[PDB]
Amino acid sequence: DLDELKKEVSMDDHKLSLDELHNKYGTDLTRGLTNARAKEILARDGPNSLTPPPTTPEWIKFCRQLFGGFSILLWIGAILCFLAYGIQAATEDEPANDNLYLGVVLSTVVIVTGCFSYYQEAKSSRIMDSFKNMVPQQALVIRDGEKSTINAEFVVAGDLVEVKGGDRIPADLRIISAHGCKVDNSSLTGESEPQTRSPEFSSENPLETRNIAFFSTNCVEGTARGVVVYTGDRTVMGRIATLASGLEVGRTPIAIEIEHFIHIITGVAVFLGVSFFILSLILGYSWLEAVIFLIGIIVANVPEGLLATVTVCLTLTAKRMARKNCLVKNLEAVETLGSTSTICSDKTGTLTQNRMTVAHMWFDNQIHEADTTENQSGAAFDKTSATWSALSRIAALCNRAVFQAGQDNVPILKRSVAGDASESALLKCIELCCGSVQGMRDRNPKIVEIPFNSTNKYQLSIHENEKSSESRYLLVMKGAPERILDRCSTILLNGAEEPLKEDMKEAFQNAYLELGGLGERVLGFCHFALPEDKYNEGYPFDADEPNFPTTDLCFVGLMAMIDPPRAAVPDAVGKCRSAGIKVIMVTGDHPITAKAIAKGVGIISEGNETIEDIAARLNIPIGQVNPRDAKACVVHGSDLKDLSTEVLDDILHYHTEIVFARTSPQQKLIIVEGCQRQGAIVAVTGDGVNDSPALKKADIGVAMGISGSDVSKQAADMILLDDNFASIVTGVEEGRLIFDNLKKSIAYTLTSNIPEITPFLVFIIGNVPLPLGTVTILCIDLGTDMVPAISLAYEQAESDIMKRQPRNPKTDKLVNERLISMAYGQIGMIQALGGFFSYFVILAENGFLPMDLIGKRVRWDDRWISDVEDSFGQQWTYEQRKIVEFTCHTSFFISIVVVQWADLIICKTRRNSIFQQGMKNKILIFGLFEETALAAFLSYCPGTDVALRMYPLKPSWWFCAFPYSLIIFLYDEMRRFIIRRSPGGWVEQETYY
Amino acid sequence: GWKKFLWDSEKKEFLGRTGSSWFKIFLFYLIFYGCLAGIFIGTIQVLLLTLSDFEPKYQDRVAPPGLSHAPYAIKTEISFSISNPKSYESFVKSMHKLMDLYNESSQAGNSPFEDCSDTPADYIKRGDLDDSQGQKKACRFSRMWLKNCSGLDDTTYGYAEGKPCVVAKLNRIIGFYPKPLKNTTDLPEELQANYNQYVLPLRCAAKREEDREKIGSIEYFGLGGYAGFPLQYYPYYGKRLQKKYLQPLLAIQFTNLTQNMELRIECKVYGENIDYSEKDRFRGRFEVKIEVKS
């Protein structure tokens, strides 16, 4: 699957002849292939079906999640536990089973976290399947001179294939004979434009010529014949589907951030481990003691509950987004939005409302205004000229939409109309001041209609004339004003006709620019009376050859219409500009209108200017001005069809407000691939399959939901349900919000690591009784700290997030050294000191003063010394001193909770004060209450000395950690104060996360 | 990367900062940690002011006294060959370490030792737990009281010919008064004979019913010839108020011990404020695994 040979622009053999192509495929133009030859090729080339994707079994990635940084350390912990158990079982009789339990539990922790990571790294991709639902089941092939419908997979290169309006093109064909055949290249051109397929050649670009039908498209109307030039994975839609399924996924920003800290955490873990293991044997420690050490140190360093906290945090924000109408398929896409700095959106159906209303009209060299208000409370437009009547007949006849059955009750403007928004707006205006269109339509029977063509750029039809004294034929046609202007020679002025001298041609140009500058879309309507002498009432004008005079028509007048903007569109554009997200308008209407919509939504800020605007303000040629004095620019599609790569790089590198008009959504992908290249996260907004290769390679693909197709939505990462644009801004804000909270929660979880690491370290350097066991640790990181860390996600904003520029990926991170200096360096140190305080207090009250504790470990752990003298001379048996050590573990754990109170409060806000933000987060309050209730339950419940080894505490001990907690609160409060008064100083570049 | 983040020569940076940054960070951490240390020390000094020097505030984790012995057994087993002398050396070195503290040379003069009843007697209260009266006085405990296990005659103490000794001792507790069982109809079988109220009885037996026969004649040595501890050596006033204090001892000779076979012997003290524990196998009683393999 060579990607570079698939990234290249398609080439072809279109510029050929009918004789030169059969030879290339061994076929007959009037008899097709033979059945024997057909099967010989069917076996030579393979079936005409897209290849299935390479797949990934599920136990592979689950087993992968079981091996990754924190899990390897916990694995070596379980292994060590079983090693120490084996040693005990082979060296001593009646071996307590404490170590085997601790090991089975560590293995359980690894197994469950794995599940949380599997849930986070999901890749729900069924691309090729959506594509497979494309190709009809059976095609119509002509072999040996006979017509047969065979399994499309059985079509080969060379046979003759016939198509009919409504059927799907089974392969890439070379049209040989057509009969008014039209195709819908929505998949390559991105447009529902009905391109006609003619046997003749018309453009050097194979995608633009008409003598080629393409797989993945459908013949809207007409019938055609053709030779098969491409089949299978080689068709056009074949490179589209193979390219979509082939793109290596990669690694989202939040993933790279989660990797960076596992690296740092592991650094301090191995540094402390290999070093103290060598130290343990440099001091004479035996093997069964060093193994216990190693384990305690590994558990102490690894935050056994973090990763699962992150996975939850992210799940909560995804539910908030679904409440705001943004549904996310992949968990990490929640954060990719905040880190975005470039957006490629569309104007039709997202910014605008697409609901069209008739605003202005041109006729009798005079602009007329129509009432465009809900309750119809305004000014009429003078319905007394014949011109208006002819206009009503043109629009009311040359229009295929009709009100939805059963609307006889609603008003003329609020009823449902089945069709495009332009035909609907025209139908409503005619039904508004011209009465019932249904009778106006039955009053003139439509004989033949030639639907809209992407090449003809017009809709025409010849209906009968209701004239009782004139039994002739009427022809009407509508289309772009330029195309229609080129097809006339008379003008219906006040009823009579007149020539098309340049005076009215210039009045028509000024009228076109008047309606265009108003942000409206204009259309031209013309008609002509066919002479009944050259086309009698019996002659049938089949839509095949030139039966109607394309030129010499009678232009009656232009018809504009309004598409207003959405409520939040101006606000959303302002929000994007405030944040620093480069917006890029890509649409498919005329640039004269595109500029107006740009000025109307914000893309072109009130003040910026284009090179043409400067040339017009200084009435000088455009080749003289310097392109650096122009902030914005309107790039045309044709000029995009003929543009190199580096040029596009410079186009995006030198302009802040770019707008692309006359663009075929194919080119879109090109612009997206040009936006990612410079170094910025890219999002995109799409609706169909032409956007599939663009949504897949973008950092984040935003697909529409109501108007979008299964292919586009199933291949994207984020789906919108209201098709609005304000939701994009909301997504970016929520992506930032869930980021600052992850920082706070990480500092939280980390801070308590020091009070768990230090007891062990003093255990080896000073030789004092073990202060904090391993079971107590697991009870701290897996118990009391989970709920608070989860609550830290519900924190609201402090300042304005939608105002700062996007974070830099190469310099700003998630876990820097500032946080390490706070959690590991300052707060954690105070918490460790408080724990040691409560420790020494418990031992001093029972008889072991601090001077006699240094050096006692060798005998304090000796299981056969039933006489250990304390500071007062009392003799303590082994189990009696062990009970006190366990009670010291219980109080150490409670001290941890007490200091965690002030840590959760100083972690709530990063800069602001508590008396400003406020304790409005009910989850945090519930976390504190539950955190205390759990510690009291674990200590006071009967039988906890048989299970967890935790004895009850005497009410005077619980108050040994209070001063340290208040001190932590005061220190962080004064910390978060100099930052506010001294911006850019020492406290900021040293302690500001 | 590798080289630059280590030492660049344009900005004169090492590891990432200049000399003034490393100096400001180091100075800050030194002041911060210094304040932390001073605060912890102050909070520990107030703690030294909150406790008394003559008595432990909490005495509940040591209410039922233990029962230890003189030999140091790794797994509560005494195994030694009567031929190879380098087999019972680790034991004798201990026994000796324990008895070496009851030497008469140590116990001499009026201060701080006092001659007490050669026959078991009652308690003796030397006042309260104060410093008003000077260093209290403790009763003298002679070596010779232990007759065949004293290391004065047969230094080895028995281990030389298949007749080891075991010096039992009651764990020292401040203000603890031993209370023996009264003469009422409910009393164990053993305790009936020789009910000297003033003596806390110690009696050893076999863990299993079978082993009875294989254990021979348990001969106890003690103050007055009884198998117990005289109440006159109580209570204990603590190290600070009674340095140079000796706790009674009881010797136990396991004469007539079957050869080449593991014997489980459980010794137990009886009394009111004495209670055993199924978890702590040294609370009031003790177990020994003797095996004189020769």
Ligand SMILES: *[C@@H]1O[C@H](CO[C@@H]2O[C@@H](C)[C@@H](O)[C@@H](O)[C@@H]2O)[C@@H](O[C@@H]2O[C@H](CO)[C@@H](O[C@@H]3O[C@H](CO[C@H]4O[C@H](CO)[C@@H](O)[C@H](O)[C@@H]4O)[C@@H](O)[C@H](O[C@H]4O[C@H](CO)[C@@H](O)[C@H](O)[C@@H]4O)[C@@H]3O)[C@H](O)[C@H]2NC(C)=O)[C@H](O)[C@H]1NC(C)=O
């Ligand atoms: C408490 O009392 C201990 C015993 O006291 C003895 O008996 C009491 C009743 C009094 O009569 C007292 O005056 C006695 O001394 C006392 O321990 C004793 O200390 C002495 C002095 O070091 C030891 O003498 C040395 O003996 C060794 C060999 O010892 C063998 O036997 C012992 C067991 O008894 C084994 O443990 C050894 O391994 C040996 O198998 C001699 O080699 C050594 O030679 C030295 O002296 C000679 C002159 O005699 C010189 O020529 C040499 O150069 C050496 O300098 C000594 O003769 C005696 O062994 C030891 N007894 C025991 C049982 O260990 C103890 O110190 C007192 N403690 C306190 C705190 O008061």
Ligand SMILES: *[C@@H]1O[C@H](CO[C@@H]2O[C@@H](C)[C@@H](O)[C@@H](O)[C@@H]2O)[C@@H](O[C@@H]2O[C@H](CO)[C@@H](O[C@@H]3O[C@H](CO)[C@@H](O)[C@H](O[C@H]4O[C@H](CO)[C@@H](O)[C@H](O)[C@@H]4O)[C@@H]3O)[C@H](O)[C@H]2NC(C)=O)[C@H](O)[C@H]1NC(C)=O
């Ligand atoms: C602790 O307790 C024992 C037992 O006390 C006895 O049982 C208690 C449960 C309770 O009911 C007491 O009231 C009760 O006395 C004390 O030892 C006992 O002492 C008596 C008296 O000497 C002994 O009785 C003797 O039994 C002999 C045969 O076994 C008999 O020949 C003796 O004759 C003597 O008395 C008669 C009058 O009855 C007199 O005519 C004789 O000339 C001779 O003096 C006598 O009846 C018990 O056997 C003893 N019990 C045991 C187990 O030995 C013990 O003294 C006491 N200790 C203290 C310090 O108080």
Ligand SMILES: CCCCCCCC/C=C\CCCCCCCC(=O)OC[C@H](COP(=O)(O)OCC[N+](C)(C)C)OC(=O)CCCCCCC/C=C\CCCCCCCC
């Ligand atoms: C008995 C013992 C008990 C101990 C108990 C305490 C337990 C230990 C507690 C914490 C362990 C700390 C471990 C070290 C942590 C360093 C953090 C770290 O490595 O983070 C990584 C950062 C990267 O950051 P970034 O991505 O933003 O970079 C962007 C750069 N761009 C953008 C320019 C390219 O790299 C950097 O910071 C650069 C690396 C700096 C390394 C400094 C090493 C200091 C370590 C020890 C000093 C001890 C001296 C003591 C004596 C003092 C004198 C009296």
Ligand SMILES: CCCCCCCC/C=C\CCCCCCCC(=O)OC[C@H](COP(=O)(O)OCC[N+](C)(C)C)OC(=O)CCCCCCC/C=C\CCCCCCCC
């Ligand atoms: C010696 C012992 C040392 C102990 C050290 C550890 C201490 C840690 C524990 C508690 C610290 C408490 C700190 C008190 C802070 C109070 C701050 C405050 O009051 O700021 C007022 C705010 C600001 O309002 P505003 O102007 O923005 O409103 C605008 C309203 N508009 C919009 C309608 C106009 O008002 C609000 O936040 C709204 C009202 C919120 C009321 C919160 C009351 C609950 C406070 C604490 C819960 C207790 C936890 C106990 C844990 C122990 C468990 C056993």
Ligand SMILES: CCCCCCCC/C=C\CCCCCCCC(=O)OC[C@H](COP(=O)(O)OCC[N+](C)(C)C)OC(=O)CCCCCCC/C=C\CCCCCCCC
């Ligand atoms: C919003 C949602 C709210 C939900 C709140 C839920 C709160 C749940 C509240 C209570 C349920 C607690 C479980 C009940 C345990 C009953 C245990 C029991 O009745 O034991 C009695 C006997 C003790 O007998 P003894 O005195 O003769 O022993 C003498 C032993 N000598 C002499 C050798 C020392 O037990 C024994 O023997 C053996 C002891 C067996 C140990 C079982 C303890 C389980 C260990 C850890 C699980 C705790 C996890 C925390 C869950 C928190 C949920 C919030």
Ligand SMILES: CCCCCCCC/C=C\CCCCCCCC(=O)OC[C@H](COP(=O)(O)OCC[N+](C)(C)C)OC(=O)CCCCCCC/C=C\CCCCCCCC
């Ligand atoms: C926010 C949610 C709050 C709720 C979370 C709960 C908080 C605690 C969280 C984790 C604690 C895990 C620590 C593991 C400790 C195992 C201790 C152990 O194994 O000690 C070994 C003992 C020794 O017994 P022995 O042979 O001497 O007995 C002889 C009995 N004779 C002789 C009388 C017959 O054996 C025994 O105690 C046997 C009983 C085994 C005890 C298993 C306890 C498992 C505890 C937690 C696992 C579930 C947590 C899931 C919640 C996740 C929250 C996100």
Ligand SMILES: CCCCCCCC/C=C\CCCCCCCC(=O)OC[C@H](COP(=O)(O)OCC[N+](C)(C)C)OC(=O)CCCCCCC/C=C\CCCCCCCC
């Ligand atoms: C910024 C940091 C904030 C820190 C807040 C800390 C809050 C601490 C909360 C409670 C303190 C623990 C409770 C103390 C209970 C001790 C019970 C006890 O058994 O005590 C006895 C000892 C005295 O023994 P002795 O040998 O002299 O007796 C001699 C007797 N003869 C003369 C007859 C021989 O008592 C003593 O040591 C008492 C000495 C205690 C001195 C420390 C004072 C603690 C400061 C404030 C407490 C909080 C109250 C106000 C709350 C305000 C809320 C906003």
Ligand SMILES: CCCCCCCC/C=C\CCCCCCCC(=O)OC[C@H](COP(=O)(O)OCC[N+](C)(C)C)OC(=O)CCCCCCC/C=C\CCCCCCCC
């Ligand atoms: C049981 C646990 C107890 C824990 C108690 C801890 C108490 C210790 C608290 C603070 C002591 C540390 C003071 C360190 C002072 C020397 C630092 C120094 O050399 O700094 C130099 C800078 C001035 O350089 P520059 O910025 O002009 O140069 C610009 C440089 N360029 C351009 C690179 C940005 O200094 C500055 O900026 C000024 C910043 C000074 C730092 C203020 C931090 C105050 C924090 C806490 C005090 C509150 C204690 C409350 C306790 C209540 C107890 C009940």
Ligand SMILES: CCCCCCCC/C=C\CCCCCCCC(=O)OC[C@H](COP(=O)(O)OCC[N+](C)(C)C)OC(=O)CCCCCCC/C=C\CCCCCCCC
């Ligand atoms: C990175 C994490 C660091 C974690 C810090 C852990 C702290 C513990 C570290 C080692 C503990 C060693 C044991 C402490 C005992 C010292 C003994 C002592 O000193 O006995 C002198 C006096 C006692 O006198 P007495 O004769 O009246 O008592 C009894 C009188 N009788 C019995 C005759 C009645 O004790 C006194 O005065 C008070 C002395 C209390 C000892 C505090 C010394 C702590 C040293 C540094 C801690 C600061 C750490 C800052 C973080 C640095 C990170 C680099």
Ligand SMILES: *[C@@H]1O[C@H](CO)[C@@H](O[C@@H]2O[C@H](CO)[C@@H](O)[C@H](O)[C@H]2NC(C)=O)[C@H](O)[C@H]1NC(C)=O
């Ligand atoms: C010590 O134990 C021995 C047995 O090991 C006892 O002596 C035995 O007595 C039986 C008669 O009951 C004789 O058949 C054996 O020949 C004897 N053996 C020996 C080695 O003498 C002896 O009575 C016990 N002595 C004490 C004081 O308990």
Ligand SMILES: CC(C)CCC[C@@H](C)[C@H]1CC[C@H]2[C@@H]3CC=C4C[C@@H](O)CC[C@]4(C)[C@H]3CC[C@]12C
């Ligand atoms: C048990 C005792 C003696 C250990 C004391 C270890 C102390 C001195 C260690 C623990 C964490 C360390 C700090 C952790 C993080 C940073 C940030 C980095 O960019 C420079 C080094 C610096 C500032 C370290 C300096 C030394 C430090 C404070």
Ligand SMILES: CC(C)CCC[C@@H](C)[C@H]1CC[C@H]2[C@@H]3CC=C4C[C@@H](O)CC[C@]4(C)[C@H]3CC[C@]12C
């Ligand atoms: C606000 C902070 C920084 C103040 C900290 C003050 C520290 C440095 C003070 C508070 C209490 C003081 C100690 C209290 C008690 C004693 C015992 C005495 O026999 C010698 C001095 C000594 C050892 C003091 C040394 C200094 C000390 C620890």
Ligand SMILES: CC(C)CCC[C@@H](C)[C@H]1CC[C@H]2[C@@H]3CC=C4C[C@@H](O)CC[C@]4(C)[C@H]3CC[C@]12C
């Ligand atoms: C603002 C700051 C400096 C105040 C710090 C107050 C310190 C000195 C107070 C706060 C809590 C107090 C301790 C709390 C609990 C106990 C247990 C009790 O059985 C004896 C007193 C003792 C050991 C206290 C000693 C003094 C103490 C540590």
Ligand SMILES: [K+]
């Ligand atoms: K941990």
Ligand SMILES: [K+]
């Ligand atoms: K994608």
Ligand SMILES: [K+]
């Ligand atoms: K932790």
